[PDB]
Design a protein around this ligand. Sequence first.
Ligand SMILES: O=C1Nc2ccccc2/C1=N/c1ccc(O)cc1
Length: 274
Amino acid sequence: PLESQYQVGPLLGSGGFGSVYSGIRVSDNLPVAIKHVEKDRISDWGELPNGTRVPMEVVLLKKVSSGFSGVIRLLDWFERPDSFVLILERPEPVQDLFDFITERGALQEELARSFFWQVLEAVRHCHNCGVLHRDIKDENILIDLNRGELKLIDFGSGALLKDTVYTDFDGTRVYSPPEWIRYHRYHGRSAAVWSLGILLYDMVCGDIPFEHDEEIIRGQVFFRQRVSSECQHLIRWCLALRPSDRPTFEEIQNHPWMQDVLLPQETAEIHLHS
Ligand SMILES: O=C1Nc2ccccc2/C1=N/c1ccc(O)cc1
């Protein structure tokens, strides 16, 4: 074991998730991402299936780990004196969705449809594995530019999926639902759908719709870019004020705006010039 297995590269990013570097598994020259999280900054702790103290983030990552490429895969992890290090897979080339939108502005709907659709599949796999992400946003989605495949990252605000009410939340406030802002209460699925509405608006308009608490609770959507009525309808549906008025995942994916999605490789060929 140890750090004789990986070769540390350049720092890729840092924030409330920790510090993530580009790395390479020395044994087979595999692209990886090495994430460092400080023990003092870990508020949410969980217990591993076998029974050990590790970040909830690790527990969640293991539960969503499969051959399905829609969620980042945890290849290994290590416990250090005052930190945990997570070895995650790393697509190359890659660009996260926030940077992609920052550079390209509002996305054409065919592209938003392919991206949104893949996020939905990804979120669904999480929930099917009994994991709630709680921080769906553009900064937490990676685009494998060659394959046109999206990957959901950063499970550091997540939790075990449950049917009961959540009274805690440390995700992004501007993607958080009116029921959280006003009452510090939300249910997993409907909160997720609310953030998915914020993400879709972000994709087709080039920016989030709400910046202030006042705006979230009002829930009034103004489209700053030209967006089809079908797309506006689905966004509006995802951003319903009453959680029970929001669509299920099945309803979102059955929506008329979501029909005839491009396959990922097709998406890369048309829009990511691959
Ligand atoms: O895997 C990654 N490749 C990248 C390339 C550029 C910028 C960020 C990243 C990654 N970040 C991660 C952050 C939290 C995770 O749980 C997993 C990956």
